Symmetry: C3
Subunit: 181 residues, 3 copies
């Protein structure tokens, strides 16, 4: 089992009841909060910078989460910071960005260096959020580049917590199957 | 652990199915005869069922999933894929229906409830919106995917030629023992 | 360990100090130059045609590199040829194309059959380079389909070698961790 890998003396720190599929790859300076889930063939690579993920957040199949090293081309680099109750859809590409709490990241979407996604935002599937772009709390964004479509509805606001909740129940089923061992 | 039982349900594999040892298939998934699932593809039939027809390829890095039934999506969305379908590399299929003799372009995305009819081409990189029905005999391209042109006779023949080529190719990969 | 696989009597040829993550999959008729690096969950499938990659080139997480077999639909097929100091971003999709030296291929970009990317070109993240498209040296290309945006800057010119060199150093660290075994 080499899904959770120590890198230069730094071991990923996992909260309680974290699911990491045996086929996922997590490396180095990464923290995941309680009840997080990392699904088949996802990569979370915290080698050249740090990665911090909150509680009850899913990183779905085929997603890649990475960072940008500090250099003269990017002074200070770009770590990756992700909040609680975030649903990261299949095949997402998250790079050096900041994501708040209660956020839906659509499958196949891409969030780039220095981008900031505020609380309670929906990023539609396939969207591209450009470097340094700020997504305003309470809105749906769509397209390449991602543009504000409309405010979220009350049903959608509810879904942030319910949907993350469903993935918590699901990862508990996968944990019961022993898919992380 | 490329073919995993989930809550007592084991994937059902037809005759001569190739599943690369690096792919991940979970739960309520049925694959027809001569299907192939290529390196690092995921077919996750946990919250709903997935059915794939005969002579269909699911190429490298593709992810196939479904939507669970709730008040938000009453009944949910299973994933149904027909025969002689070529699902290109890094495709994203979610709770949709695909007919027979269909090309799904590499890096394309087919969303919940969409239906691709027989003999359709979805161009590489295209996104087929939720609920959209793609008309038989046409090429769809773009984000969002739009009808661009009718397929050509040579393209029509390619559905079958190409699926056949992948059948012969997966037999070579099986012969190398890549599924074990 | 089945990351580097013989196929129909042909084994991948690896140069000096090459890193292949244990979770990547390399098949058949593939050659990698000195100091190349292939990152978690990448696929390089040289079954129906040849794939050649030069020195100090990275193939990043979740990328898929493949080719097109020779047939009446594609006379002679399309092999995959990649030069030195090429940075292939996460989740790239390279199919049957030719890529020169000192090239940045953005994450999630797609380069298709018969495309030719000249030396010192930047392909922006998420771009699709159409089949047969020629990318002229010294320019930035962006979009779907990819179009010329502007010439590269001097800092961008220097980054091809800097960035590739940074990945050579990074892969030595990953080798030191034994991630390829």
């Amino acid at each position: 089992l080499t899904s959770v890998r120590t890198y230069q003396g730094i071991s990923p720190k996992l909260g309680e009841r974290v699911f990491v599929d045996r086929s996922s790859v997590i490396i180095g300076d990464v923290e995941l909060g309680d009840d997080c889930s990392v699904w088949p063939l996802a990569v979370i690579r915290g080698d050249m910078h740090h990665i911090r993920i909150g509680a009850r957040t899913s990183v779905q199949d085929g997603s890649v989460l990475h960072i940008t090293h500090a250099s003269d081309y990017n002074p200070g680099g770009y770590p990756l910071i992700i909040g609680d109750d975030v649903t990261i859809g299949h095949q997402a590409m998250l790079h050096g960005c900041t994501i708040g709490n209660r956020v839906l990241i659509g499958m196949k979407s891409m969030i780039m260096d220095g981008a900031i996604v505020e609380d309670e935002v929906i990023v539609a599937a396939g969207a591209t959020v450009s470097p340094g772009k700020v997504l305003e709390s309470g809105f749906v964004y769509m397209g390449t580049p991602a543009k504000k479509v409309r405010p979220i509805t009350e049903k959608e606001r509810s879904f942030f917590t319910y949907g993350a909740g469903n993935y918590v129940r699901l990862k508990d089923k996968h944990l019961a199957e022993g898919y992380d061992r």
